[PDB]
Paper text:
Each of these enzymes catalyzes as their main activity the cyclization of N-γ-acetyl-L-2,4-diaminobutyric acid (N-γ-ADABA), the reaction product of the 2,4-diaminobutyrate acetyltransferase (EctA), to ectoine with the concomitant release of a water molecule. We demonstrate here for the first time that the ectoine synthase is a metal-dependent enzyme, with iron as the most likely physiologically relevant co-factor. The EctC protein forms a dimer in solution and our structural analysis identifies it as a member of the cupin superfamily. The two crystal structures that we report here for the (Sa)EctC protein (with resolutions of 1.2 Å and 2.0 Å, respectively), and data derived from extensive site-directed mutagenesis experiments targeting evolutionarily highly conserved residues within the extended EctC protein family, provide a first view into the architecture of the catalytic core of the ectoine synthase.
Crystal form A diffracted to 1.2 Å and had a unit cell of a = 72.71 b = 72.71 c = 52.33 Å and α = 90 β = 90 γ = 120° displaying a P3221 symmetry. Finally, a monomer of this structure was used as a template for molecular replacement to phase the high-resolution (1.2 Å) dataset of crystal form A, which was subsequently refined to a final Rcryst of 12.4% and an Rfree of 14.9%. First, the 1.2 Å structure reveals the spatial configuration of the (Sa)EctC protein ranging from amino acid Met-1 to Glu-115; hence, it lacks 22 amino acids at the carboxy-terminus of the authentic (Sa)EctC protein. This structure adopts an open conformation with respect to the typical fold of cupin barrels and is therefore termed in the following the “open” (Sa)EctC structure. In this structure no metal co-factor was identified. In the “open” (Sa)EctC structure, one monomer is present in the asymmetric unit. Indeed, a similar dimer configuration to the one described for the “semi-closed” (Sa)EctC structure is observed with the same monomer-monomer interactions mediated by the two β-sheets. In the “open” (Sa)EctC structure, both proline residues are visible in the electron density; however, almost directly after Pro-110, the electron density is drastically diminished caused by the flexibility of the carboxy-terminus. In the “open” structure of the (Sa)EctC protein, this interaction does not occur since Glu-115 is rotated outwards. However, this electron density fits perfectly to a water molecule and not to an iron, and the water molecule was clearly visible after the refinement at this high resolution (1.2 Å) of the “open” (Sa)EctC structure.
Numbering used by the authors:
A (entry chain A), B (entry chain A): 1 to 115
Write the structure that this text describes.
């Protein structure tokens, strides 16, 4: 069994920061689960479009509010606690946090942490 | 893109209840992501040992307190918000919620919802 704490991971190189977000990587490919599992903070005021190519991602909103806009349809979806979105390589999206947003994220295949 | 709300799913047959827990299945195998993604409530006072055979599971604690005991080692781990555990078929564990515990859970391969 693995048992790990977010607060511990946040104090390590498994916690990464970029422009507009930070993420604590709880599980990465080398943990062997066949998916990665992250606790990701999306900062207020960012306009985020990143997607790791050749991966699928699911995102559960834990805290905070904002929007996710689907550029394929023009749909603007509310983000708030309990909203989940799922993305592939073909999605064209923009995530815009109103407040900071805390999320639980899953990638398949797993993110490696080496980019 | 998929975008779905916990409150909506909870009102459907994707929300299942058993002895000691209930789960809203956000993503199942038929959603095509290659993992399932659940929001699971573990009830206060339960002593839970279930594991779906031939699956891997990761669990992030969102709310509540309790313990997870590893019968292979005798380790008793605290459950509280931000603790993540991961299990395979070989783990021998008991989860004992003190309060109700809310979790975000990932299974690989995905749960089907047909048992």
């Amino acid at each position: 069994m693995i048992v790990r704490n977010l607060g511990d991971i946040r104090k390590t190189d498994r916690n990464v920061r970029s422009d507009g977000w930070a993420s604590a990587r709880m599980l990465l490919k080398d943990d062997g689960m066949g998916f990665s599992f992250h606790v990701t903070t999306l900062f207020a005021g960012s306009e985020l479009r990143m997607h790791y190519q050749n991966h699928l991602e699911a995102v559960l909103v834990l805290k905070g509010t904002g929007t996710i806009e689907d550029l394929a349809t023009g749909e603007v979806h509310a983000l708030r606690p309990g909203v989940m979105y799922a993305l592939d390589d073909h999605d064209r999206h923009i995530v815009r946090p109103e407040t900071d947003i805390l999320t639980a994220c899953v990638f398949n295949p797993p993110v490696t942490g080496r980019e």
